[PDB]
Amino acid sequence: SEEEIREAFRVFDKDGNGYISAAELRHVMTNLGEKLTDEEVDEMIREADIDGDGQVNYEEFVQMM
Numbered sequence: 001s002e003e004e005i006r007e008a009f010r011v012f013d014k015d016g017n018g019y020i021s022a023a024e025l026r027h028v029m030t031n032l033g034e035k036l037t038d039e040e041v042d043e044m045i046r047e048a049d050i051d052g053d054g055q056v057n058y059e060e061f062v063q064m065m
């Protein structure tokens with residue numbers, strides 16, 4: 001759906017600043033029960049990080065999904 005991707009981003013962007021950071025991504029994964037390192041989180045971000053800022057914006061997130 002389109003409204004589902006909008007809702008998902010809103011939930012992962014902990015501070016609501018418009019960007020999902022590595023810390024935020026690591027945080028949700030850890031709460032779900034994943035054991036991960038910052039290196040693992042970085043690889044995930046590299047798969048979505050188009051403009052190369054190290055974080056995931058809304059546009060990048062939707063592409064990712």
Ligand SMILES: [Ca+2]
Binds near residue numbers: 013014015017018020
């Ligand atoms: Ca954020």
Ligand SMILES: [Ca+2]
Binds near residue numbers: 049052053056
């Ligand atoms: Ca980015």
